[PDB]
């Protein structure tokens, strides 16, 4: 509905004889779409990247933290592709990005970027290089505890 | 281009015609290494790592057995030239690791 209203205003402006830039202002929106976000990261236009944690297949985003680290972009892994879809008016979104915001929110964006850096990336600097999984089952852990207790007693 | 002799036999044989220099056909650009392709392949290499046979070749090259590494690479890949190129690439990888360390 907002796009139809903007197009009606621009059509009125063209009919009366001014350019559409005279009636429309420069937009500031969340950037989304996986190919678009990867292109923005490669062109170093993205200021902040949020990557969904449950993308299936995982190959679509498995290179993204390494790409952001090489390009110097701050990234954060966030729970919910549906949660990003609620931002981008979709059912799901694999990744979202901010390139630029308005002047009343640039301070908030800088504070968020610094907070994401200090409270996420410094904490996951060491744990991102570790192997996951390897957890044993309940009965297997109980059997292992029982045999270690038996070996310690004997 | 070398001008032909005008004879039916011998070196540079054939009918004498003035030759033209041709611009490179864009179909002949295949194999040229592009900048984005460099960046993407480097990122994928450092994300994915090495194959087990690549690890074996790297261990042989660090131990200094070069002919054995070439023979192992030929047995794995299939051809001598592919083995030579793979051994050169793993030598380059060893060189970057050594210059970092």
């Amino acid at each position: 509905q907002e796009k139809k209203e903007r197009l009606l205003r621009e059509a009125t402006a063209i009919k009366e004889g001014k350019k559409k830039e005279d009636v429309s202002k420069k937009p500031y929106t969340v950037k989304y779409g996986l190919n678009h976000v990867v292109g923005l990261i490669e062109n170093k236009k993205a200021s902040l990247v949020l990557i969904a944690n449950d993308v299936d297949p995982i190959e679509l985003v498995v290179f993204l933290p390494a790409l952001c680290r090489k390009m110097g972009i701050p990234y954060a892994i966030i729970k919910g592709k549906a949660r990003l879809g609620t931002l981008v008016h979709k059912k799901t979104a694999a990744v979202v990005a901010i390139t630029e915001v308005r002047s009343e929110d640039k301070n908030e964006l800088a504070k968020l970027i610094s907070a994401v850096k200090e409270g996420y990336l410094e904490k996951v600097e060491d744990t991102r290089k570790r192997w996951g999984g390897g957890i044993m089952g309940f009965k297997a852990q109980k059997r292992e505890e029982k045999r270690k207790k038996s070996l310690e007693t004997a | 281009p070398v001008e032909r002799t005008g004879l039916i036999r011998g070196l540079n044989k054939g009918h004498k015609t003035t030759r033209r220099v041709l611009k490179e056909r864009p179909s002949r650009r295949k194999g040229a290494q592009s900048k984005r392709t460099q960046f993407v392949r480097s990122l994928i290499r450092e994300v994915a790592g090495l194959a087990p046979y690549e690890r074996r070749v790297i261990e042989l090259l660090r131990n200094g057995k070069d002919k054995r590494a070439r023979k192992f690479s030929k047995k794995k890949l299939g051809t001598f030239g592919r083995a030579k190129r793979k051994c050169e690439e793993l030598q380059r990888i060893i060189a970057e690791s050594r210059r970092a360390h």
């Binding site: 292109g39 490669e42 062109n43 170093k44 | 984005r36 960046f39």
Partner: peptide, 9 residues
């Protein structure tokens, strides 16, 4: 930066 192509403007 990495670019697929030269972009307009």
């Amino acid at each position: 930066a990495v670019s697929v192509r030269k972009r307009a403007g």
